[PDB]
């Protein structure tokens, strides 16, 4: 199982403002994970695109476990994300009948052409 830091969709310490720009005009199910703005209520923030808006979701790490809410039963952020690529988030919140479909990859680099 791969580490969080090498995961294409993990962008570490970028701002909420930078994520806005990355998710501008993207399709539903587009997502990426970054570090939480602050420190005392969740380690990471998953941001996904739904209905032309951005939905921010705290990821908690306690006692060697990860998840969106108690009980935390995932072994890593990678395992949690991978689980919801194929499974809807609806079981947590009615507004999130959507899967994690399209990662914003830090490896996917487009080249502007110079003549």
């Amino acid at each position: 199982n791969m580490s969080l830091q090498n995961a294409e969709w993990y962008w570490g310490d970028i701002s909420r403002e930078e994520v806005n720009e990355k998710l501008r005009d993207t399709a539903d199910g587009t997502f990426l994970v970054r570090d939480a703005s602050t420190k005392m209520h969740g380690d990471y923030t998953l941001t996904l695109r739904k209905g032309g808006n951005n939905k921010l979701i705290k990821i908690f790490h306690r006692d060697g476990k990860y998840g969106f809410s108690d009980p935390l039963t995932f072994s890593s952020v990678v395992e949690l994300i991978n689980h919801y690529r194929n499974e809807s988030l609806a079981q947590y919140n009615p507004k999130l009948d959507v899967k994690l479909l399209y990662p914003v990859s830090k490896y996917q680099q487009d080249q502007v052409v110079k003549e």
């Binding site: 951005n54 939905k55 921010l56 705290k58 999130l96």
Partner: peptide, 8 residues
């Protein structure tokens, strides 16, 4: 807009 989701 950005919206923080209640997951509980």
């Amino acid at each position: 807009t950005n919206e923080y989701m209640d997951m509980k």
